[PDB]
């Protein structure tokens, strides 16, 4: 019933074309929204770090420990930088890649809807035109034949007593002649059909196969954008990402309790210089 | 100038204020951790909304076959990365914030007024150890004045004597007193100078000992803090987590699985020329 081969069902193939352009928008929007997220995460890391740096040194912490604590903001900065890069990449590489591909692939007609869709609809319409026509011709004939066959059954039931009369057998005559004429036309229409079906199928097939090629360029491309995105999202394939954590561990393992204690001593404790009491002659001078 | 030396009276107060500072620092660390946890949570949350959103528009859109799966797979990464930022959030709050919170609670005990019991204990250790030296320090300043002043006066009497060009005897006995006064007060000033010198070593020993108790208390806080900074570091470190890499390994595997020709073959039987057809035949009665 809903077979591609029944009149008009090619439309489902045509509509895939249109769809193809929406899916590009879809994917571009998607990538955009993802970038907005990577960026917000990034920007909030930046804020937090700035703030903590200011707080930390505007506060009482001193020494190597101050530095280790400080070291944590430095990962916040480095990790913020990484997300910004991701955002930048999606936007300047991915979005652009899809935008560029789409505008070269789908050409807008000033009427509206795409030149490519139109081209495909026309081609199918053309391929199916003669064929759709015989179809209408055949059914008419099949029906005429069936009608004739019915009338004859009737005349026959009619002969099977009682009231010159000769007009009745002259009806069963006219009806066997109708069956014949009618059967003949039905058969010839059937024949032209069988004669034009190999060509109908070659024509549909060429159009179909062009549309398949066109969706193939799209799908193969899509698969490629998808890997690109995955490559841009994956911090784990960026050698930098482990550096940020090694560098922090170091800054932290580098802190020394006993180094700081001893600084304090010389800076605010017993380690500081003293002018011990000495005698003073009275000169007022 | 050693006006600020810790060895001057009252100047131990910098070591005392350091105790109070540690509590405050503990608070700062907790505030810092929480705020970072909140950034982790938000990025996670934003990822799950995104994944929800696009999971749905993908389902309802015209994208089908193995490509819909590959595109869809990206929503799974958003979700799993999201789940990983939530573990970072929870480790920070439930292990790290909690660990500092506890330690603080067992180290600083608020008193009724209330300062911290640990501060008061040091204020008093210092008071106690500085008591004799503080005393001897005001015996000296006094002794010194009594001397300076008595010299100043001697010059004065001598001066009237010069300015004199009976009672002239009441003016040279007036130098005679002022000479005895310079003697007696210099003896005092000198005997005190000797005491402070002599008892300087025990002033220092006392002080150095209270200060050592302070150092040890700070040491405990410093060693705690480094253990903590390391804890924060492990919890933040997705760059060396198994599951992080794995989400991208799975993502790549899903994307690579997608196969254009297959999708196309599918489309062809399903909606194309490969679909089943009932071609016209001769039809009876
Ligand atoms: Ca879908």
Which residues in chain B are contacts of A233 at CB distance < 8 A? Answer: 74, 77, 248, 251
- What angle do helix axes B65-91 and A166-233 make, rounded to 10 degrees? 40
Solved how? X-ray
B207 with A270: Cβ contact below 8 A: yes
**Cα–Cα dist A216/A208, whole Å:** 12
Domain ranges (residues) in chain A:
1-271
Mutant choice from B239, B240, B283 vs A, greatest count of A C-beta within 10 A: B239
Using an 8 Å Cβ cutoff, are B273 and A201 in contact?
yes
A61 with B25: Cβ contact below 8 A: yes
Q: Is B59 helix (H, G, I), strand (E, B) or coil?
A: helix
Q: What is the DSSP letter of B106?
A: T
| Secondary-structure percent of chain A, ordered helix, strand, coil, rounded to 5 | 80, 0, 20
**Which numeric CATH code is attached to B1-274?**
1.20.1270.60
Asked if residue B232 has a cis previous peptide bond (ω within 30° of 0), the answer is no
Q: What is the DSSP letter of B93?
A: I
Beta-carbon contacts below 8 Å between A and B: 229
Q: Is A171 helix (H, G, I), strand (E, B) or coil?
A: helix
A265 with B236: Cβ contact below 8 A: no
H or E element that contains A25: helix A11-58
B32 with A12: Cβ contact below 8 A: no
Using an 8 Å Cβ cutoff, are B118 and A252 in contact?
no
**Which numeric CATH code is attached to A1-271?**
1.20.1270.60
How many angstroms is it from B57 CA to the middle of ligand 1? 8
Give B168→chain A minimum CA distance, Å: 28
Give A95→chain B minimum CA distance, Å: 15
Cβ of A156: how many Cβ atoms within 10 Å? 12
Confirm or reject contact between A198 and chain B (CB < 8 A): no
Phi-psi region at B65: left, alpha or beta (left = phi > 0; alpha = psi -120 to 50):
left
Phi-psi region at A63: left, alpha or beta (left = phi > 0; alpha = psi -120 to 50):
left
A41 with B46: Cβ contact below 8 A: yes
Q: Is A114 helix (H, G, I), strand (E, B) or coil?
A: strand
């Amino acid at each position: 019933t809903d077979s591609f081969w029944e009149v008009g069902n090619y439309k489902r193939t045509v509509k895939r074309i249109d769809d193809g352009h929406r899916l590009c928008n879809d994917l571009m929007n998607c990538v955009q929204e993802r970038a907005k997220i990577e960026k917000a995460y990034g920007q909030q890391l930046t804020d937090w770090a700035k703030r903590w740096r200011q707080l930390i040194e505007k506060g009482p912490q001193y020494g190597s420990l101050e530095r280790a604590w400080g070291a944590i903001m430095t990962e916040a900065d480095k990790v913020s930088e990484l997300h910004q890069e991701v955002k930048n990449n999606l936007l300047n590489e991915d979005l652009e890649k899809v935008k560029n591909w789409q505008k070269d692939a789908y050409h807008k007609q000033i009427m509206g809807g795409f030149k490519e869709t139109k081209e495909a609809e026309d081609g199918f319409r053309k391929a199916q035109k003669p064929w759709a026509k015989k179809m209408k011709e055949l059914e008419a004939a099949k029906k005429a034949y069936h009608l004739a066959c019915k009338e004859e059954k009737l005349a026959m039931t009619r002969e099977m007593t009682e009231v010159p009369q000769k007009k009745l057998q002259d009806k069963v005559d006219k009806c066997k002649q109708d069956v014949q004429k009618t059967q003949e036309k039905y058969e010839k229409v059937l024949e032209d059909v069988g004669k034009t079906t190999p060509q109908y199928m070659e024509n549909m097939e060429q159009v179909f196969e062009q549309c398949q090629q066109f969706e193939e360029k799209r799908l193969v491309f899509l698969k490629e954008v998808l890997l690109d995105i995955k490559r841009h999202l994956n911090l784990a394939e960026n050698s930098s990402y482990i550096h940020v954590y090694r560098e922090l561990e170091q800054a932290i393992r580098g802190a020394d309790a006993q180094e700081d204690l001893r600084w304090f001593r010389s800076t605010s404790g017993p380690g500081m210089p003293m002018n011990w009491p000495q005698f003073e002659e009275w000169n007022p001078d």
